[PDB]
C-alpha cells in the first residue's frame, strides 16, 4: 500500500538547496519539498524532486515532529562531518 524511495544526497556544494513546508499541526503533516534551488547540493542529485514528502532523514522519522524541529534535524544532518551524504526516505503521497 505505501510507497517509499531512498534518495541519498551527496554534499557537492556549500548549500543544501531545498525549501520545506509542514510538520506537526500543519495541513501538511509531513515535511514536503516546495523549491529546489539551482546549483545547490540537492539540484545535482536530480532524483530529489519538488512535491516529495520526507518521511525519514538519516534514519530518523519526521512523523510527529513540528516544522521547527523537523528543520533542526535536516540542518544538523547537513552541517555534520560524520557523513559526506544525507539519506532521505521520500514519498509520492
Amino acid at each position: 500500500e505505501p510507497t517509499s524511495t531512498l534518495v541519498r544526497v551527496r554534499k557537492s556544494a556549500a548549500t543544501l538547496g531545498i525549501a520545506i513546508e509542514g510538520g506537526a499541526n500543519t495541513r501538511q503533516p509531513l515535511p514536503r519539498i516546495v523549491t529546489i534551488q539551482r546549483g545547490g547540493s540537492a539540484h545535482n542529485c536530480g532524483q530529489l524532486k519538488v512535491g516529495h514528502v520526507i518521511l525519514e532523514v538519516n534514519g530518523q522519522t519526521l512523523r510527529g515532529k513540528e516544522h521547527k524541529e523537523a528543520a533542526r534535524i535536516i540542518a544538523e544532518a547537513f552541517k555534520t562531518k560524520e557523513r559526506d551524504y544525507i539519506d532521505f526516505l521520500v514519498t509520492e503521497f
Binding site: 543544501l16 525549501a19 520545506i20 513546508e21 528543520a71 547537513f78
Partner: peptide, 8 residues
Amino acid sequence: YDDELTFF
C-alpha cells in the same frame, strides 16, 4: 495563524 517555510 501561521504558514511556515524553512530554506536550506
